[PDB]
């Protein structure tokens, strides 16, 4: 059906700039007005901006007016949010969305949401994690993803071949301001000598991609 | 002033029904609203729209146990035979000329799911971390309910407070809670003790795991 896929989130210094993209598919993009919404950590949803189907009319919340600009490309079917003069309090998950309003009829009156992308405005610089193996009839093994900033990190096992029994824990935020998390998978003990287990860690803000083999 | 008013929290029993209320400010009693569901640490999911005549416009795959209704300036979302997955923050949302407006959201708690004791896994420092002249003990706690836990670390048999960081419990996809506790040590503190233990207390019962250099 309708899909809204965002990209462009990341870490920015205060006063800096960033542009978010929302690639739309499954409907005639140019027919519908598109919106941006954000959610600060632990807060509710906050409207950011709207743009008409043609792109001729834009609308902004007072908290972002004059610093954020919305645009769209109706051939690439992409929505944009250009941020300049970013502030600490702009830190949030940003969502693109399609709100249909009324005048539509059946399923055409549905609303749709992108998956969200995290934008962090901070004077702190990015740091990639160090990845350590957690060795070794069932055995638990894992990967410690230590000392990174900011969120998020993604962890997979054997590049997605191993999903059953995998548990990636929410990160702790240490007093130093760095995060750590761990991922654990339970496997048969008989497999340790024959099956190789690798955790694949990705921290996009720091261009960190690590494949850590976890041995007995 | 176009405003949507929602109570911050609500609760009901597993398997029972609940109705959430969204109130439109005076002069906007004819407005259409939409309900959006947001599970903790996920993105929102559109549910339906509700105008004055009740009605719906359900999103794809929204169960029949979700319904909406309307009366005057108030808009309702009713969920019957509540399941654990229905625990989420529910936002009503509306629009006027050139603006969107959100309510503050109503966080729904579904009480009296089965109690469950925690599973505990304790990892020692890896040889790689020790060669980096650091040491971390990793205590992973999962599958417990309710989500209140207490973690206590022991060096040999003596309590240890310094260097402990623990997450607040959070409900995972199996609808049970998980948490983790990290004890940061120097390599020499790690090698100078006979063992360290992670002690997890939940509903008066204590689970303990121990690792040694």
């Amino acid at each position: 059906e309708v899909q809204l896929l965002e990209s462009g989130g990341g870490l920015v210094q205060p006063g800096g700039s960033l542009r978010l993209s929302c690639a739309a598919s499954g409907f005639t993009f140019s027919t519908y007005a598109m919106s941006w919404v954000r959610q600060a950590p632990g807060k509710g949803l906050e409207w950011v901006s709207g743009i008409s189907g043609s792109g001729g009319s834009t609308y902004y919340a007072d908290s972002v007016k004059g610093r954020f600009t919305t645009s769209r490309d109706n051939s690439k079917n992409t929505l944009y949010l250009q941020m300049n003069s970013l502030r600490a309090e702009d830190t949030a998950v940003y969502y693109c969305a399609k709100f249909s309003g009324k005048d539509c009829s059946g399923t055409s009156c549905r609303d749709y949401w992108g998956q969200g992308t995290l934008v962090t405005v901070s004077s702190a610089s990015t740091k990639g994690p160090s990845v350590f193996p957690l060795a070794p009839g069932t055995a638990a093994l894992g990967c410690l993803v230590k000392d990174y900033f900011p969120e998020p990190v993604t962890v997979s096992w054997n590049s997605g071949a191993l999903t059953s029994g995998v548990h990636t824990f929410p990160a702790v935020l240490q007093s130093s301001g760095l995060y750590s998390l761990s991922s654990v998978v339970t496997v048969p003990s008989s497999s340790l000598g024959t099956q190789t287990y690798i955790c694949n860690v990705n921290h996009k803000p720091s261009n960190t991609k690590v494949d850590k083999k976890v041995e007995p | 002033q176009l405003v949507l008013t929602q109570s911050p929290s609500a609760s009901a029993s597993l398997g029972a029904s609940v109705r959430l209320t969204c109130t439109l400010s005076s002069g906007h009693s004819s407005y259409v609203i939409a309900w959006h569901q947001q599970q903790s640490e996920k993105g929102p999911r559109y549910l339906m729209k509700v105008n004055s005549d009740g009605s719906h416009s359900k999103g794809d795959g929204i169960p029949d146990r979700f319904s909406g209704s309307s009366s005057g300036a108030e808009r309702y979302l009713t969920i019957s035979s509540l399941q654990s997955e229905d625990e989420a923050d529910y936002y009503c949302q509306t629009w006027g000329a050139g603006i969107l407006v959100f309510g503050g959201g109503t966080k729904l708690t579904v009480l009296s799911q089965p109690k469950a004791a925690p599973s505990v896994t304790l990892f020692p420092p890896s040889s790689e971390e020790l060669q980096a002249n650091k040491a971390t003990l990793v205590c992973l706690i999962s599958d417990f309910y309710p989500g209140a836990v207490t973690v206590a670390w022991k060096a040999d048999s003596s309590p240890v407070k310094a260097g402990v960081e623990t997450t607040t419990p959070s409900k995972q996809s199996n609808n049970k809670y998980a948490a983790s506790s990290y004890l940061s040590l120097t390599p020499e503190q790690w090698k100078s003790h006979r063992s360290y233990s992670c002690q997890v207390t939940h509903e008066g019962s204590t689970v303990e795991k121990t690792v040694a250099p």
Partner: peptide, 9 residues
């Protein structure tokens, strides 16, 4: 009062 058909025409 008077809710428009669409917020962003």
């Amino acid at each position: 009062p008077l809710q428009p058909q669409q917020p962003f025409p």
